[PDB]
């Protein structure tokens, strides 16, 4: 039957709200939850980026 | 028939007291084909370390690599004396023998390795409690002598003499020669950059029973923090922690049907004090992780792994990530679950941490 | 501190260990079922009488009647056939249970060697069967609980198909789609086999992911499955109460009222002080022989229905409470381990924010307070009106308050009693849910313990001392005990409703006027046995009549008021009293012993004192509730007339 | 929030080791968090955190008293010491052995 | 063609207590051997307002570490000083985390 | 046990004009994809992805 | 694999699944393992030796 069993699951949502006319503006709201382990040698890493 | 699964058992027996002196017993079997154009590939490696002299700080290490590939037997035996002169400079005096098929050559070597970290900031060590990525540079200076007791070996030495004396770009292509095949890829996948070598001397003096070719050459390993040799130089060489002759046997056999690995052996340095009073089972060196992921990404697999950390009595694990599934009141067992996901992670090249903190 | 109730804790057990334990338990359960089947043999196949109608077998009986076993026959030959079938199936259960116990021992020792073929079967890797395992799975679930749900559902499908086969061949029930008759449970067993085989293969090819349980399955998966199966057991109890009241089950349950039973401990014919068996009340029966208790008057059909329904209901409620408590234990483990911040799943991340916990618990508390106050005010006002104190007749009571006509479909006679029953069940559910939510969210730190710098560091710590004048019983174990005590009220409401009682008032049927006029003003064709307080008086007539039920009454009461001793805040007083006891026992020295009395009088720990207190509290309470449900149904379909026309 | 870090402490509890008054004032006053794995110095960024309320540094008693009159000398109840002289600092008291 | 043999069975001190933080529960006393009697209650005032705290006699207390290793302290007053001087409220404190919630827009939790 | 990513943003360069009067969402920069590829190939996974 | 007439497969990385006269067919489990190996970059061998 199928192969490559025992896979994890990643749930992701994205939203791109574009603006009409000559304005090329967009509003991107993305969410993701991945149950795979991270590749961080110092694992408990939480970063918040305000640009 | 289509399912490929990996069956692994791991046992870490730590010993009481400040010194770790732990024993590692690992069995592994995987149905996936190996990533080797020459199959079957079988290898036995025996690494035994003996304290030559504690007052001098001299340790003696013998490594016996026995391998069979395509019905051909290769054997690299090497006995060496390692001595920590300073925390940066280390000296080695040794003799060995490489016998491939009917061919065999004996070598002797004097070698100085000077490892210097780029940044010696007290701020980083003050803030970061667990330093992983430590950049640095290792300068190797090796004077190696081989009896030119074989006509083909003499031809090799003669051709190399002319090659060095003819081409000025030889210091760049010698890396291509040295990193034979996928090795040249792996150094880039592990953060290792290798400088062009410098041949200090290339001469021959003759012994009564046969000539000896002497070659002194230097090279500069460069680690971008991921390299175990540079970043964990102190954890590399637990000579002070070594008073009993330690030893590890490791054999892996690779038929196209599957790969079978057995690694049994005791050695010091398994657990180090991470601060805060909790001993930590040492962080995984990342070079093995990425270099094994290079071949592990090539196929998918089901995970059946089981680690059995045997703590000495009176000690308890305060942190495990992922958590231990079962406990025998001394032995902490990780079987399946997020540990299986972590085993998949490290098999495919993941550098995620597995923090085992245990204390009195 | 490993106690005698911690040696079997899952933290020390592996997967194979619990497999072996479950198989040993299944085999022991089969042996117990054989005991019960033997206990149901009314006439021995030898040609002799049988056993005196144990409650265990009286519960088991209608299900056996549903099968080809256990005919509802007074004819001696057919009853002997019933005994023969019961004994044969009991022996079969004994054999299968013996093999199951053997397998459980093999899995407990981790010694899996087949005698016929000297090979060792690896628990982590194997094939389920010689060819079938290779047909379906081609291997084994890779030591992960999520990967096992597929094979588990496949095994359940196999068991359903086997049950259908057994019904088809041994019990002789041909599957037909007529769901009113018995011979469709096998057809539905086959349908469920198909459905669960599909689900199992889907879950094997696509394992569902709730990665919280996989790591420490021993407690997380245990808690989740226990709460889920507790709700399943509550649903099974509800379904059983609905179905056993249906006409379809009537040939298998109403006929239980037609036949009389000679129960163990049912009062015997009383001989006099001088009975020359060489005076006796009821001389036709032999001396010291059990007088028959008529099912029609006893309501044995509804008595057995109530026993089944409340057994499953209380077991489900206890399983829910234990699931919440074990989940709280796991949550405390991961909170001390630092893994609580690392779970990454909705079942934890939503409760990770303490303000969300506050909002949820406050909403639960507000709903509980509102519903409880409403229903309790209704109850006490009905009591006031029927007792006429403060000059209020029952016309001022909540007799008008019926369930809504849209919602009236699920009640026999719509009345305030059903309204109060539903409201009390919801209020008690939320009342216990307050403590269940406290266990779920406040395993480590309550918002008060966040403000006041303390944290819970164990699952069985007594308290944190007299600081702040409190700290008693903040352990998740103590919150579980409080949840159990709070759900005692809900379980009591369930039992009293299924037995038949006026929960809308307290004293219904007492010689007071407006208590008797309740039925006259309510227009009910059902005469509920009695009100909340009058329930004891009306239903203890039989409990006093039967010596065995009175013995249970006394023992349960003793158990309860012994729980009192360990429930109260008296452990230090008991400790100093025990030291005085030890000192006087040492004063047995110089009473001519010449023996060093090394016996310190023990006093339970508070974490153990609450454990014993709750166990004895629940045990006595529901040992007595067993008598509530074993007194009889005693509900006559006759409205009461008004005392005054 | 509370579950992250040590659940008792609202702010990061930074005990102060007895590094003091042995060489030109010993400006490297040892600040150690409740976790205790690292051993930080009292840099102005740590003071920024401390005035932010995210962390809180506390002086212990059973040790050589840490520049107890050179850091600050307000001794109304012997626990009125402040770093930037307007800190509102708090001292941990331990009369461990001196009391019975 | 030729291969070597293999075997693989895998497949199939000076502890202190901060009385300012301590609330007087006395689980240290239960964790202390009776022969030492290092933990002791010291009474200050009304019992219900916090009242008594607990103290260690350093001379009597000789490096058992049972109290701290038991990790039973709710208040975190039970501290361990190290030879290098670091102080520990708990054997392993959970890591501090930057907390911020997740709400999928199209999933039911939005 | 996991990774939890939340991005809220307002960007002025999401849309790029194309020939023929067509406008498109901007081509994905490839450095992000490739640099994520190193860590993305470490586990076998199934994705439940929505985009609006 | 269709060989020259008079030749047979002697040694093989995972053996042939089927064999008609003059025709050999590799399929099934292990060959699929090798195919999945080489698709993702595996450099493992498939040593097919045929002799007269
Ligand atoms: C491997 C990554 C780095 C490297 C990092 C190191 C490290 C690390 C060390 C040396 C050291 C040495 N290096 Mg070097 N070195 C590399 C490449 C080279 C090359 C080459 C052309 O490939 C040469 C000629 C040398 C030359 C030498 C010698 C001068 C010297 C002693 C070798 C010896 O005894 O080996 C004997 C042979 C072995 C034991 C074979 C197996 C080697 C592996 C790496 C051992 C792993 C141990 C295992 C995880 C745990 C074992 C437990 C056992 C109980 C011990 N290096 C590359 C670039 N080099 C040592 C030193 O500083 O000398 C002064 C030293 O500490
Ligand atoms: C500028 C960015 C990096 C850095 C980049 C480099 C690089 C790159 C090299 C050195 C080199 C050296 N640096 Mg530096 N160095 C850093 C900070 C430091 C610190 C410190 C206080 O942490 C110290 C003590 C040093 C000191 C030194 C020596 C360890 C080493 C040889 C000295 C020499 O060539 O002159 N650097 C900063 C943080 N340093 C050289 C050396 O040979 O490295 C092995 C070299 O080529
Ligand atoms: C000449 C080689 C170098 C050297 C190179 C390295 C490197 C590089 C590494 C170690 C690592 C370790 N070494 Mg060393 N190490 C040296 C000297 C020593 C001595 C000693 C007193 O002689 C001792 C006791 C040790 C002991 C140790 C451990 C503290 C540590 C492994 C921890 C673990 O659990 O491994 C588990 C045990 C194993 C998995 C067993 C492996 C057994 C096989 C036979 C050896 C590895 C083979 C390798 C994969 C292939 C080499 C092929 C090359 C072509 C030669 N090293 C010498 C001087 N050692 C690692 C560590 O974490 O460093 C901090 C690491 O990264
Ligand atoms: C409806 C089915 C329930 C269930 C019903 C039961 C019942 C019923 C019993 C167990 C038992 C056990 N179960 Mg369970 N259990 C469920 C789910 C789980 C899960 C899981 C999904 O992760 C796990 C890991 C376990 C694990 C365990 C162990 C704690 C133990 C068996 C191993 C052992 O050898 O015990 C070592 C000891 C023994 C096997 C026997 C010890 C002696 C006696 C028989 C213990 C009786 C205790 C008590 C009176 C049971 C009363 C039930 C009430 C009357 C309602 N259960 C499912 C959902 N389980 C038994 C256990 O020991 O409980 C504490 C037990 O009684
Ligand atoms: C009493 C019946 C018990 C039982 C009693 C025994 C006994 C006794 C033995 C094992 C053996 C084994 N058991 Mg068992 N075992 C039970 C259920 C389980 C379950 C499970 C489905 O949850 C697991 C994981 C196991 C695990 C294991 C295997 C590792 C091992 C067989 C290896 C294999 O390839 O065999 C292929 C077949 C299996 C995987 C069997 C699976 C279980 C079946 C349902 C029952 C077999 C025994 C029964 C009396 C025979 C008739 C069965 C009917 C035809 C269905 N058992 C059932 C419920 N099991 C045997 C052994 O070690 O073999 C080397 C052995 O001697
Ligand atoms: C299993 C552990 C014990 C055992 C303990 C019990 C208990 C306890 C009871 C019986 C009862 C029965 N036993 Mg038995 N019995 C065992 C061994 C057997 C075997 C056998 C060859 O193994 C057989 C054929 C029987 C035969 C039978 C019948 C005479 C009778 C009714 C079965 C039926 O309705 O099942 C219905 C079958 C199914 C629903 C399908 C198979 C099970 C599925 C896969 C699991 C899910 C359903 C679960 C049972 C209920 C949960 C519902 C939730 C909604 C999910 N016993 C072993 C030794 N036996 C019953 C009794 O006497 O009634 C008065 C009863 O309650
Ligand atoms: C619904 C299926 C299962 C269920 C499956 C799980 C799973 C899976 C897990 C838990 C876990 C826990 N369970 Mg549960 N659990 C159920 C019933 C309960 C009940 C109860 C009396 O209703 C309680 C009090 C508990 C208690 C608990 C806690 C110990 C713990 C969650 C802590 C947390 O932060 O939650 C935060 C609170 C929530 C996320 C609440 C919201 C629930 C869902 C996700 C959202 C939609 C439902 C919506 C709010 C209600 C209306 C629609 C419904 C369809 C009726 N379970 C039922 C029986 N439970 C976890 C634990 O760690 O176990 C050891 C775990 O892994
Ligand atoms: C049947 C029920 C009870 C007992 C039996 C009993 C036994 C007992 N208890 Mg009690 N108790 C309550 C009920 C019972 N308490 C309640 C409801 C409360 C809530 C307030 C409560 C609370 C406190 C506090 C606070 C303290 C004590 C003590 C103290 C004793 C010490 C010596 C003494 O008094 O002997 C006088 C008492 C006896 C003669 C008891 C022994 C035979 C008996 C005649 C009847 C036998 C019943 C039988 C043992 C049951 C099962 C039999 C079989 C299945 C094994 C002592 C023997 C304390 C001390 O140690 O000193 C007094 C203390 O400080 N309590
Ligand atoms: C929402 C909450 C559920 C509604 C509450 C149940 C009322 C339903 C009802 O009246 O059904 C009506 C039927 C009974 O309906 C009538 O009842 C009468 C009372 O004498 C007579 O028995 C009549 O014959 C019968 O028809 O009730 C049930 O089916 C009883 C099943 C028990 C349901 C409660 C189980 C939940 C357990 C809660 C435990 C709380 C722990 C804290
Ligand atoms: S360390 Fe030992 S002597 Fe000191 S208080 Fe703890 S148990 Fe008592
Ligand atoms: S455990 Fe903590 S709160 Fe309790 S007595 Fe000891 S120091 Fe005080
Ligand atoms: Ca009744």
Author numbering:
A (entry chain U): 3 to 53
B (entry chain V): 7 to 366
C (entry chain A): 58 to 335, 343 to 709
D (entry chain D): 21 to 120
E (entry chain B): 4 to 15, 131 to 228
F (entry chain U): 263 to 314
G (entry chain W): 315 to 366
Show sentences the authors wrote.
Upon illumination, the excitation energy is sequentially transferred from the chlorosome BChls through a monolayered baseplate, Fenna-Matthews-Olson (FMO) complexes, and ultimately to a membrane-embedded RC, where charge separation occurs. Because only one gene encodes two copies of the GsbRC core proteins (PscA subunit), the GsbRC has a homodimeric architecture with a symmetric distribution of pigments, suggesting two identical branches of electron transport chains (ETC) that could be equally utilized. Two membrane-associated PscC subunits (cytochrome cz or cyt c551) contain the cytochrome c domain, which mediates electron transfer from the menaquinol/cytochrome c oxidoreductase to the P84026–29. On the cytoplasmic surface, PscB binds two FeS clusters (FA and FB), serving as terminal electron acceptors.
The two-dimensional (2D) particle images were reconstructed into cryo-EM densities with different assembly states: RC-FMO2 (one RC core with two FMO trimeric complexes), RC-FMO (one RC core with one FMO trimeric complex), and RC alone, which showed the varied stoichiometries possible for the RC and FMO complex. The 3D cryo-EM densities of the RC-FMO2 and RC-FMO1 complexes were reconstructed at 3.08 Å and 3.49 Å resolution, respectively. Note that the FMO1 is the one seen in the RC-FMO1 structure as well as in the previous structure. The cryo-EM density of the C-terminal heme-binding domain was resolved at a low resolution, and only visible at lower contour levels (1.0σ). The MGDG lipids can be found in the RC-FMO1 structure, but not the BChl-A816 or PscF. PscF and BChl-A816 were not found in the RC-FMO1 or the previous cryo-EM structure, possibly due to their weak association with the complex. Because the PscE is associated with PscC and FMO2 but was lost in the RC-FMO1 or the previous structure, it likely plays an important role in stabilizing the association of PscC and FMO2. The FeS clusters and P840 dimer that drive the ETC in RC-FMO2 are arranged similarly to the RC-FMO1 and the previously reported structure.
